[PDB]
Design a protein around this nucleic acid. Sequence first.
RNA 1: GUAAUUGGAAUGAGUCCACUUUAAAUCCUUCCGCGAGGAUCCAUUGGAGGGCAAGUCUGGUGCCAGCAGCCGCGGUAAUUCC
RNA 2: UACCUGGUUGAUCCUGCCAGUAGCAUAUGCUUGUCUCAAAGAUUAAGCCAUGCAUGUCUAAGUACGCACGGCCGGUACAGUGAAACUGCGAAUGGCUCAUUAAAUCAGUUAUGGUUCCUUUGGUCGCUCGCCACUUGGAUAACUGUGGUAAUUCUAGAGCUAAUACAUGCCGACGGGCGCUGACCCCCUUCGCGGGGGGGAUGCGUGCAUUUAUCAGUGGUGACUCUAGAUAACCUCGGGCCGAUCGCACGCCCCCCGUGGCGGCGACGACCCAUUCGAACGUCUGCCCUAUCAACUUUCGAUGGUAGUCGCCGUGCCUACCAUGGUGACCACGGGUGACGGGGAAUCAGGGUUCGAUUCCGGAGAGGGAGCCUGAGAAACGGCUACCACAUCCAAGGAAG
Lengths: 118, 204
Amino acid sequence: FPMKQGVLTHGRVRLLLSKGHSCYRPRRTGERKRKSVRGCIVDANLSVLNLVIVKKGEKDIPGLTDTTVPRRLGPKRASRIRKLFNLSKEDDVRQYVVRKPLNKEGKKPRTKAPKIQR
Amino acid sequence: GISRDNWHKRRKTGGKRKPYHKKRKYELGRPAANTKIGPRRIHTVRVRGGNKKYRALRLDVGNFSWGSECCTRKTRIIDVVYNASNNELVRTKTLVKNCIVLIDSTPYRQWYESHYALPLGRKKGAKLTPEEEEILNKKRSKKIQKKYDERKKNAKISSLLEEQFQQGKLLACIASRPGQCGRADGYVLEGKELEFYLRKIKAR
RNA sequence: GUAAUUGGAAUGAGUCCACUUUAAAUCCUUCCGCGAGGAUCCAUUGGAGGGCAAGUCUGGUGCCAGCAGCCGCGGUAAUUCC
RNA sequence: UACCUGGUUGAUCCUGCCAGUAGCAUAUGCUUGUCUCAAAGAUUAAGCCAUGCAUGUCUAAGUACGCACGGCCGGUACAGUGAAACUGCGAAUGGCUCAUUAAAUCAGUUAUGGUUCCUUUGGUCGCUCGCCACUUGGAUAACUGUGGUAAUUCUAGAGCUAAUACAUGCCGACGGGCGCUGACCCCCUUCGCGGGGGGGAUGCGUGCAUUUAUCAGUGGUGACUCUAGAUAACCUCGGGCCGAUCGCACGCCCCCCGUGGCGGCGACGACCCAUUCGAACGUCUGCCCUAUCAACUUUCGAUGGUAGUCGCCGUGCCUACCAUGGUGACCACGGGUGACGGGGAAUCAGGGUUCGAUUCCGGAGAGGGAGCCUGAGAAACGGCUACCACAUCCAAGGAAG
């Protein structure tokens, strides 16, 4: 049973959960359900805890802070591509949309670009 | 889950009637709003038809009317002074429909003086020199002085009514339904209706 | 009606190809092929004293066994049982 | 077909019941070749359920950057097919059941001289004078990569990416006009007077719907506190509207001018009015047996009055304060029902008697009660939550009925 922000009581309790809290995916609209979830205080009673770096210091740990994974889907709406490339005004956004290569071995090497919104 | 239907009432002769259906959804639960005086807390409840009524937890001002001069303004609500239904709802300052409320008099004063150019709210004198001295003389023109001397037939106030213009706090009667519309509107007492509510509140 | 001999441009129940039917099928209809003399290709359920249409035929039992909605029938010749 | 026959006696005439007689509807017994229709776990158990299922959904038109397919038709936003996911709409219908319920359900009734109600259908959507508008902002799913448990349609973290999701917000119409105010009009009678009007120097308010108050009296109903009008104002931050939406054929003016302006059929929307489908709650009249059920209701709402609280609205519907009432031998009240109501069904001189769980309509309930979410519509059960009853898996920690 996963953890939950705001329970503040170590161990496992049961919560009545609607759409939008956490830890619960509702199956029809308005369906609430009572489920058991774990507190936000950590103990030695976990099977795995999830852990996120906010700052890099000393050196390169192998497999974790190296070999940069490329961001393969860039912007789609016509406002964050204007916020990314710092286009001042009317600089033909259709020219500057990120075009991804597609690399099947049985086909000729395609490239593919999204649509544009707004 | 409190119902408001008739099938749980005893019948006219005095017979118990055994219920034939469960309590439905179209006799809806009824928590009261208990509107009192403070800063603006309004809640919304969706009702049948998808509509909304604004139940008003905590109200500050009102939209009280005057009728005889046709002067309706906002005004802040001083206090709750009388209630015909329950006497317990005036020790806790609860705003219901027909409760006798207490409002101040500063928009009515700055209307009445700005329309007739007479003093109003002043009984002793020697204090109105900074702003209330100029408002009625103003160095008007001639025909303006002609059309404002002829309003000296309707500028009377009944003696019970200008008394509460002096000490600042008019007593008004709410006509809106707060907790049901979200506003606390109404009208100011005057005349035989004021004298009726004067004799009630004093004699308590 | 005994009792037949027969047979005849008689036929189905059944058996079984082909269409039709239907979403696809099966039925029903349509039509090859076979298919009737104890046509053994077999009609049953109840009754037979009265009410109430039909036996005082024969054997068996002897107030027993049983029948009979009701009256009643049976004790050694029962139109009423088996 | 308005119909009778046998049995008390030694015989008779009667009363009286028993038996016979004919339907139809349940069950069974023996029997059963053909063919058209066809009832069918209602009565007792509204007992209990293994397993499988019975509610999902894409157009030309909300959102594809899945290589999963396509001619990647050539160096560019997308020739389209498209899985998935978000979004929207349905799941409140249909189906089954007859346990409850006796005035309850139910049935009938109500010229320029001036340049409550999603939907559907029909309306209305430049009526408002107020440094992005050639398009504003943020987040998330499918996806990718790491996982946790014995387990379930369980899900966590990390990184992307969209809208008709969730918000923010303007130009235009826009030239103005009305109402209230208001530094200059003299020409009126300035005679010392009292002056009679038009103009503006100023600053507010202006539509639709909501809330409240007042005045007057477009079109209607035996009937309105109706509709429409006018004034004074309000306008809830879980904030009322006044298109930051998607296809299709493309054109017209191109004179500011080869970069701009103007246009047709739609599709989704959208406060309100009407309509449609209803729903809700009232009026009048109508029901089986029972007195070995004659007084009942009223602390605890019983009948009414006043003021309100909530409710979609009327109402003791609920509360506060009052009045002491309402009902009854014309059967109240209590109890029973092997009571779901009706359209109907068997019977048949007329008059009646009996049946109606059962395909049509209405109602009620989804093991028994109770409470809610979402939605236009549910107190929903092939939706949730809790107790009671029964029952499922387990690695014993928990999961799902």
